[PDB]
Design a protein around this nucleic acid. Structure first.
Ligand SMILES: Nc1ncnc2c1ncn2[C@@H]1OC[C@H](OP(=O)(O)OP(=O)(O)OP(=O)(O)O)[C@H]1O
Ligand SMILES: [Mg+2]
Length: 747
DNA sequence: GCACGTACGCAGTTCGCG
DNA sequence: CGCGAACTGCG
């Protein structure tokens, strides 16, 4: 397969490198025939003579137009006459792109901000991660000595553990008599020994957890400080820390650094994203953690280092086990977008969609729209459109509830009505599809750009969901659930891409249509099931709704539901279909987006309640869960009152564990761009002054202390919470946590 | 040479001023 | 001393 692609400079000309593992042997191919290029639109062909004269300087070397060739392409389906401008080195584009654009004759330039290595993959039709070639993996993690005030990566590395399919081992420079701990005295020698291990085993993939920000970055700093040649790559090169905005990423030429952190953050939604929490969510088994306070104590006292080695070994052990199950999922993702696994595992869903559209646009000789300037980006972010339909739920308890839901509503709407930028208000067509309310017209004579690509993703989701029923192993069922969720988010992102301010194929009118279509279908289906079939819709949210026949029994409501499904699906066009997504005995609808139902097997499923929100303490989630259990199962309202009263008694008496009193919250911005400072923002700003880097996406876990005033002023991180010194604000967790989450069931 | 991180709608908490 | 803005996370 094709692992990755980059380019070096030989005699001032770029040389594309293709890292590939063909027939079980590493190989690097060299292509020196690819030339940088980008298009330009001119008012008159006679101005091409005054365009080749435009020059620019790039550190002494003057940048000139190598060659020029007029090509005929298409822009959103209509033909266009553009001039292709060739260049010597890729870096010549960023130096002359702005000079060529501002020419009074040049209308606009196109495809000027495309990386060379990634332009080679699209133009040459090369697709990475394809081919029956198994990849050798090797996970590794490091243990560090951190002190309050010490700059990051300034302390020594205590242990360097690694794990592959052949077991897990730990390397340290302090005598530990454990069968898996190999002891060698120098930290440098530890690094150098780790260098021999990787070079000897020669893994194709290097799996880490947050290694781009800690494990591999810490190792790279010891490289430049201790003066070591960490030739870890297959070309004799050393790891390179690359910048991606605020975060950084480590690259190892010839190999693939698979950082599982960005992968898990896009696949699983957990309150906290620690390695011990991800292991519990995937494999369903607990993982013990050794904090830095105990690692620093074991290093100084010398006692207990065996347990520290057990933590480092387990760190690499679970990292390989998690990587062995999540790498194939990302390989499939890389095969769809057609980009290296390195870039795909660290890219957002919006970027993945754009990189796939850029490849398909080249396959169809379609000149790609260019990203918006800062002005248009701000203009797109300020504008919006009406979302989905939401109906105020009927209050009270209801019995014999059915949940009818549309099958991929928004994606199906795009394919059925050919909602795409190239088809929006296209003139000269024979058949059109008008969007409700919004009125946007879409050509249906030819398949749209986006609709022609969304069909396959929908089929894949129904295939994965089909194996979920045919799977008996719980581990394979959850892994398949992750795959179908990944396909749902990716497909739905195609819709969200229309509203993405940074999207090349930005189309608000396309996004307005998908919602207008969905709002019309759900509102008409609700009216049809009520007027014709006599159903009573209780709750409705976009693609689905909760309905029932008030006085009918369970057997009647279920049959009439399947009857209405065949009646409405026959009247629905194309891929538009409504599904029977489960029956429920009794249900409770608190408010909008928040409800709770119970099925035949007495399994209570909730939606939008505080039980699944990470910003609510577990003592509140546990109390709310037992209240729903006392109401939906037993139906004893007085029993729930005694439950919340028993919880408050334990809280006031300080009898609840501190682990059950943690509140997780995410830092979605930079600590400098926060208009208001909340509890989690105040704790983050305090950790930023202590050396901890609180970057966007960090989950803040704090505990409210017993005090008077602002909650943020009495908020302390969970790590520094000692029950001997600190005492939590029992009155806060009673009045502002346990009571409110359960008070909304007042009936 | 880039990634500037898919969309809207909404319940609900924290804070701050009156 | 209720309310509005800022903020998060859910569906
Ligand atoms: N993250 C998202 N971003 C944008 N649109 C989304 C997102 N999630 C869902 N949508 C839209 O929301 C509605 C619709 O979801 P399907 O019908 O595609 O998938 P089920 O079969 O799972 O439906 P159920 O939630 O179980 O009723 C999708 O277009
Ligand atoms: Mg749906």
């Amino acid at each position: 397969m094709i692992l990755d692609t980059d380019y070096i400079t030989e005699d001032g000309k770029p040389v594309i490198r293709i890292f590939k593992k063909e027939n079980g042997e590493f190989k690097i191919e060299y292509d020196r025939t690819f030339e940088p290029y980008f298009y330009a639109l001119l008012k008159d062909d006679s101005a091409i003579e005054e365009v080749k004269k435009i020059t620019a300087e790039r550190h002494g070397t003057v940048v000139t137009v190598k060659r020029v060739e007029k090509v005929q392409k298409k822009f959103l389906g209509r033909p266009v006459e553009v001039w292709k401008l060739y260049f010597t080195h890729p870096q010549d584009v960023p130096a002359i792109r702005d000079r060529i654009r501002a020419h009074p004759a040049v209308v606009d330039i196109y495809e000027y901000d495309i990386p060379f290595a990634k332009r080679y993959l699209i133009d040459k039709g090369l697709i990475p991660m394809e081919g029956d070639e198994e990849l050798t993996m090797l996970a590794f993690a490091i243990a560090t000595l951190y002190h309050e005030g010490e700059e990051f990566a300034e302390g020594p590395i205590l242990m360097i553990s690694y794990a592959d399919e052949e077991g897990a081992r730990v390397i340290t420079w302090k005598n530990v008599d454990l069968p898996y701990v190999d002891v060698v005295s120098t930290e440098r020698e530890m690094i150098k020994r780790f260098l021999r291990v990787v070079k000897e085993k020669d893994p194709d993939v290097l799996i880490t957890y947050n290694g781009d920000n800690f494990d591999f970055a810490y190792l790279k700093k010891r490289c430049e400080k201790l003066g070591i040649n960490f030739a870890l790559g297959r070309d004799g090169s050393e790891p390179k820390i690359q910048r991606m905005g605020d975060r950084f990423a480590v690259e190892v030429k010839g190999r693939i650094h698979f950082d599982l952190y960005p992968v898990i953050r896009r696949t699983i939604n957990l309150p906290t994203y620690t390695l011990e929490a991800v292991y519990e969510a995937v494999f369903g088994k607990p993982k013990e953690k050794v904090y830095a306070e105990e690692i620093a104590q074991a290093w100084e006292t010398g006692e207990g280092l065996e347990r520290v080695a057990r933590y480092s070994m387990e760190d690499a052990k679970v990292t390989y086990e998690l990587g062995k199950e999540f790498l194939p999922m990302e390989a499939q993702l890389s095969r769809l977008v057609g980009q290296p696994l390195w870039d795909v595992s660290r890219s957002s869903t919006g970027n993945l969609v754009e990189w796939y559209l850029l490849r398909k646009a080249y396959e169809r000789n379609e000149l790609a729209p260019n990203k918006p300037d800062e002005r248009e980006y701000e203009r797109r972010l300020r504008e919006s459109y009406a979302g989905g339909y939401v109906k105020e739920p009927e209050k009270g308890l209801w019995e014999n509830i059915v949940y009818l839901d549309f099958r991929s509503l928004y994606p199906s709407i795009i394919i059925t009505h050919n909602v795409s930028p190239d088809t929006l208000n296209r003139e000269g067509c024979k058949e059109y599809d008008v969007a409700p309310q919004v009125g946007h017209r879409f050509c249906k004579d030819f398949p749209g750009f986006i609709p022609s690509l969304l069909g396959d993703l929908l089929e894949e989701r129904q295939k994965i969901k089909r194996k979920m029923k045919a799977t008996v192993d719980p581990l394979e069922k959850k892994l398949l659930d992750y795959r179908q969720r990944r396909i749902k988010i990716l497909a739905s992102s195609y819709y969200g891409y229309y509203g993405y301010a940074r999207a090349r194929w930005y189309c608000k009118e396309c996004a307005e249509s998908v919602t207008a279509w969905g709002r019309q279908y759900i509102e008409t289906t609700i009216r049809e099931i009520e007027e014709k079939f006599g159903f009573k819709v209780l709750y409705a949210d976009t693609d689905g709704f909760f309905a029932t026949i008030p006085g009918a029994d369970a057997e009647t409501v279920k049959k009439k539901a399947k009857e209405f499904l065949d009646y409405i699906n026959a009247k629905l066009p194309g891929l538009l279909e409504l599904e029977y997504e489960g029956f429920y005995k009794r249900g409770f609808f608190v408010t909008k987006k928040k409800y709770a139902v119970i099925d035949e097997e007495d399994k209570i499923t909730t939606g939008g309640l505080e039980i699944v929100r990470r910003d609510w303490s577990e003592i509140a989630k546990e109390t709310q869960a037992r209240v729903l259990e006392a109401l939906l199962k037993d139906g004893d309202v007085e029993k729930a009152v005694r439950i919340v009263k028993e919880v408050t008694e334990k809280l006031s008496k300080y009898e609840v564990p501190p682990e059950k009193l943690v509140i997780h919250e995410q830092i979605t911005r930079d600590l400098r761009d926060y208009k208001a400072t909340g509890p989690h923002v105040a704790v983050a700003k305090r950790l930023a002054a202590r050396g901890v880097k609180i970057r966007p996406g960090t989950v803040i876990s704090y505990i409210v202390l017993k005090g008077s005033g602002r909650i943020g002023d009495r908020a302390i991180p969970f790590d520094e919470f000692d029950p001997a010194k600190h005492k939590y604000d029992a009155e806060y967790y009673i009045e502002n946590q346990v009571l409110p989450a359960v008070e909304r069931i007042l009936r």
